[PDB]
Amino acid sequence: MKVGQDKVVTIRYTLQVEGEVLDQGELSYLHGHRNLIPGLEEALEGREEGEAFQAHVPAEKAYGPHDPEGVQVVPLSAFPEDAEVVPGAQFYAQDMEGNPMPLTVVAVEGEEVTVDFNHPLAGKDLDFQVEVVKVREATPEELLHGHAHP
Ligand SMILES: C=CC[C@@H]1/C=C(\C)C[C@H](C)C[C@H](OC)[C@H]2O[C@@](O)(C(=O)C(=O)N3CCCC[C@H]3C(=O)O[C@H](/C(C)=C/[C@@H]3CC[C@@H](O)[C@H](OC)C3)[C@H](C)[C@@H](O)CC1=O)[C@H](C)C[C@@H]2OC
Ligand SMILES: [Cl-]
Ligand SMILES: [Mg+2]
Ligand SMILES: [Mg+2]
Ligand SMILES: [Mg+2]
């Protein structure tokens, strides 16, 4: 069975960015419902069960470009009372509506912390080694819920 719309697809993958392995695992996902980054989904379309391949996904088809508006300066007093506020530290946060807006610390100067609200992989090209392990039809329950089930 080939990867396509409304198939549940099981893949084994390794993610590398700029020569460094960032993640590895196995995933089952519902194909064609914006559940995967667009570029990888495009690369998987039409693949047969058992196929293995490499996929270089440009930032634009992955987590998008780095938005300069995402880099902001916030007061140090906004951070958890006894947290370590240093470059690379991550904190969850939300916007003025309530949508998830996690951040990464870029730099600290006195009581001012420069943070980045961009996705950590924004602007990065992603390299995947991928194996298609299984392809099956989605169940009605999966189609109604919009994602794969165990
Ligand atoms: C609770 C339910 C949520 C569910 C949560 C998890 C299973 C927990 C687990 C830690 C998530 C991922 O672990 C599998 C982990 O995988 C990465 O490490 C990774 O290697 C990656 O990039 N992958 C995974 C392998 C397929 C390609 C890509 C992906 O497409 O992943 C998909 C993805 C993020 C798609 C977004 C969806 C929103 C779109 O807007 C965006 O479009 C840009 C693309 C994953 C599979 C989602 O469908 C499933 C979820 O997120 C990300 C670097 C970080 C990501 O952690 C956050
Ligand atoms: Cl899914
Ligand atoms: Mg069909
Ligand atoms: Mg097989
Ligand atoms: Mg100032």
Residue numbers in the entry: 1 to 150
Paper text:
Peptidyl-prolyl isomerases (PPIases) catalyze cis/trans isomerization of peptidyl-prolyl bonds, which is often rate-limiting for protein folding. SlyD is a two-domain enzyme containing both a PPIase FK506-binding protein (FKBP) domain and an insert-in-flap (IF) chaperone domain. In order to improve our understanding of the mechanism of SlyD and of FKBPs in general, we set out to analyze the kinetics, energetics, and structural basis for substrate binding and inhibition of SlyD from Thermus thermophilus (TtSlyD) using 15-residue-long unmodified peptides, which we reasoned would be better mimics of natural unfolded protein substrates than the traditionally used 4-nitroanilide tetrapeptides. In total, we obtained five structures of TtSlyDFL and three of TtSlyDΔIF at a maximum resolution of up to 1.4 Å.
In addition, we carried out co-crystallization with the FKBP inhibitor FK506. To the best of our knowledge, these represent the first structures of an FKBP domain in complex with long, unmodified peptides, and the first structures of a member of the SlyD family in complex with a macrolide inhibitor. Indeed, the only structure with a substrate-free IF domain is TtSlyDFL:FK506, which was crystallized in the absence of a peptide. FK506 binds in a similar way to all three copies of TtSlyD in the asymmetric unit of TtSlyDFL:FK506 and in both copies in TtSlyDΔIF:FK506, but exhibits some structural variation in parts of the molecule that are more distal to the binding pocket. The binding mode is similar to that observed in the FK506–FKBP12 complex. Specifically, the pipecolinyl ring, which mimics a proline side chain, is inserted into the center of the hydrophobic pocket, and four hydrogen bonds are formed: two to the backbone of N35 and I37 (V55 and I56 in FKBP12), and one each to the side chains of D23 and Y63 (D37 and Y82 in FKBP12). Apart from these conventional hydrogen bonds, a number of weaker CH–O hydrogen bonds are also present. Most noteworthy are three potential interactions between the C9 carbonyl oxygen of FK506 and CH groups of Y13, L15, and F128, which are reminiscent of three putative CH–O interactions observed between FK506 and FKBP12 residues Y26, F36, and F99. A comparison of the FK506 and peptide binding modes reveals that the interactions between FK506 and the backbone atoms of N35 and I37, which are mediated by the O2 carbonyl oxygen atom at C1 and the O10 hydroxyl group at C24, respectively, overlap with the two β-strand type interactions formed by K28S2 in the S2 and S2-W23A peptides. It furthermore shows that the pipecolinyl ring partially overlaps with the side chain of cis-P29S2 in both peptide binding modes, but is in a roughly orthogonal orientation relative to these, which enables it to reach considerably deeper into the pocket.
